[PDB]
């Protein structure tokens, strides 16, 4: 049973119609005020949809009033159809269109194909636990379009491996050789404490009897964790002259149970949730990105995290919000010596037998308190209920104030940290874990950090672990860390959600903002000049097109568009 495909395939055309409109990729035809049309590319199909216009260039697009007329003939609302229908106003060659269509059809059957069991009610999901959360989510990112292609998984690995899927398995270990191999931590992190922690003693005793019978030294390998997914369909075939020759060894798998976590490939214990997350290389395709991890990363990944900890290290400001860091303590990475002599960097067989341990959030909460994951207030049931709105009917607080208090415990830490420190992160919903209590905010916790950081100004003993993450900027364009990165690619998909829901106007939304960011700035007086070098009340700033890109993926300097400026909803107040 999946009594709802049209209410998602109606939902999926309306995002491409407001996503394709903002980035202008689809100029639609104004008929009367308000009313729209947009012409198909053989002029058989047109598409009539009422529309408001909101803040930062937001298509609110009327579903009650959407309408598909082919040959006059009127249609069910179909988004395949309708990118096929478009493909040449797209700027997709030829060549390219069925490859995307893969992509995007397997993007579109999360929703559709999804099992009636496997739907959840957003009222019951605002009391839900955080991995229920987790997995009962398939929004995807907000501006990208084919945004879960996982081009590599077959429809098992799907069942089994997909977060959407909910799956609980074990993770491979295998045994490498500490020649061939490099392992990291941050400080206080060790290898062999960090095993012990991890496995526990029958466990690794386990392991090492697997490899003393094969008549081999514990002590010449390390342990390391291998996606049961990449393991077979590439470290066992490709690696193989090395599993033969015993410099990788299977050994068996953990007892403890993972859920993957949006990301795919990075899956959480559930058994021990105080456990480490794992992030393993799935050589998979997702979002046009191979999800692999090269041991080269893996050498300095840990590196970046210890300086970054030791900047905010203490900091008084951050620990009175109570904003939290979870970093990766360690990483594992196999390097081979054939496949590395034939191969330039950053080639996928570089990619391929490498692992990193992340710090879980758990411990780090009350009892009472609630973790989620961002993502879940753009989350929308299969009835058409928003799960913000259900955080906001059970926090006792008005949505406005509801606003304000998420805004604190994640919008202000992320300023701060580029103005008082200058780093750059991803701030986008699955990269925050927000904590909950009762449904009220109440701060939050930032996730991905030695991959994605940009340090716009170190000293003269940055690490040079480090120099991978350094990376000039124009001060004409540095405030796009907020406009850009958090504004317009999160903000901009809550305030539609928000204000199409009634829960509050899309002017309410932008007045709370910019009230908002003026608190910030007049708690923070000694970073005025910083203020006033990097314009976060700037009248305009340039798009991003998230969706040109992949119909093509990620400095800003050569990203930014020429000309389409967008109107910064938060300059009027200035």
């Known amino acids: ?67 598909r007329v082919r040959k006059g003939e009127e249609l069910r609302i179909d988004a395949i159809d309708l990118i096929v229908d478009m493909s040449g106003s797209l700027g997709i060659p030829v060549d390219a269109l069925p490859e995307y269509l893969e992509e995007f059809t397997n993007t579109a059957s999360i929703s559709m194909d999804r099992p009636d069991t496997r739907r959840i009610p957003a009222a019951e999901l605002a009391v ?6 987790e997995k009962t989510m398939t929004e995807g990112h907000p501006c990208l379009v084919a ?83 990449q393991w ?27 859920q993957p976590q949006q990301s795919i490939r990075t899956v959480f214990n559930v058994s021990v949730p105080t456990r480490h997350y794992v992030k393993t290389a799935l050589s998979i395709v997702n979002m ?77 909460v009350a009892e009472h308190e609630q973790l989620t994951t961002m993502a879940a207030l753009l989350h929308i049931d299969h009835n058409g209920i928003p799960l913000a709105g259900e955080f906001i009917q059970k926090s006792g607080l008005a949505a406005q104030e509801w606003l304000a208090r998420y805004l604190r415990a994640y919008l202000h830490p992320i300023i701060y940290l580029l103005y008082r420190y200058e780093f750059k992160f991803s701030p986008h919903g699955e990269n925050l874990i927000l904590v909950l209590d009762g449904g009220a ?23 040079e672990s480090c120099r991978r993450a350094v990376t000039e900027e124009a001060d004409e364009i540095r405030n796009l860390g907020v406009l850009s990165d958090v504004f317009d690619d999160f903000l901009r998909h809550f305030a539609l959600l928000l204000h199409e829901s009634g829960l509050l106007t ?30 976060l009340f700037a009248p305009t700033f340039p798009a991003i097109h998230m969706n040109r890109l992949q119909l093509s993926m990620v400095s800003y300097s050569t990203l930014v568009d020429n000309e389409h400026a967008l109107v910064n909803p938060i300059a009027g107040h200035r």
């Not at 308000?34 to 408001?52: I, K, L, N, Q």
């Not at 839900?128 to 959360?133: C, G, L, V």
């Not at 910019?514 to 923070?524: I, L, N």
């Open 232 to 258: 077979a369909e590439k470290i066992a075939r490709i690696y193989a002259v090395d599993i033969a020759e015993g410099r990788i060894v299977p050994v068996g798998a953990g007892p403890d149970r993972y």
């Open 506 to 535: 899309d002017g309410e939304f932008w007045a709370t903002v910019a009230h908002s960011v003026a608190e910030f700035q007049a708690r923070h007086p000694d970073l005025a000049d910083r203020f006033d070098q990097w314009d």
């Open 441 to 463: 905010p109440v701060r939050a916790v930032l996730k991905d950090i030695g991959e994605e950081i940009c340090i716009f100004d170190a000293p003269d003993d940055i690490p």
């Open 1 to 67: 049973a999946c009594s709802y495909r049209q209410v998602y395939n109606t939902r999926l055309a309306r995002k491409i119609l407001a996503e394709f409109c903002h980035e202008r990729l689809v100029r639609p035809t104004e008929l009367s005020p308000g009313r729209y049309v947009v012409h198909s590319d053989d002029r058989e199909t047109e598409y009539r949809f009422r529309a408001e216009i909101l803040s930062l260039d937001s298509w609110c697009i009327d579903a009650a009033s959407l309408r």
């Open 288 to 364: 046009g990105f191979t999800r692999g991890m090269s041991a080269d990363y893996m050498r300095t990944t840990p590196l970046i995290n210890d300086w970054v900890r030791s900047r905010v290290h203490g900091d008084p400001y951050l620990a009175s919000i109570g904003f939290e860091m979870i970093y990766e303590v360690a990483a594992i990475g196999y390097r081979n010596t054939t496949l590395t002599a034939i191969t330039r960097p950053g080639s996928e067989y570089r990619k391929l037998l490498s692992a990193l341990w992340r710090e879980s959030p758990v411990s780090r």
């Open 128 to 133: 839900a636990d955080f991995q229920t959360i």
């Open 147 to 229: 945004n879960a292609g996982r081009l590599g998984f077959s429809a098992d690995d799907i069942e089994r491996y997909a977060p959407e899927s909910g799956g609980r398995f074990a993770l491979e270990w295998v045994a490498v050789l500490r020649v061939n191999t490099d392992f990291a931590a941050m400080s206080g992190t060790e290898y062999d404490t960090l095993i012990r922690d991890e496995l526990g003693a029958d466990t690794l005793a386990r392991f090492d009897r697997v490899l003393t019978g094969r008549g081999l030294d514990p002590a010449s390998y390390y342990y390391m964790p291998v996606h049961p997914w």
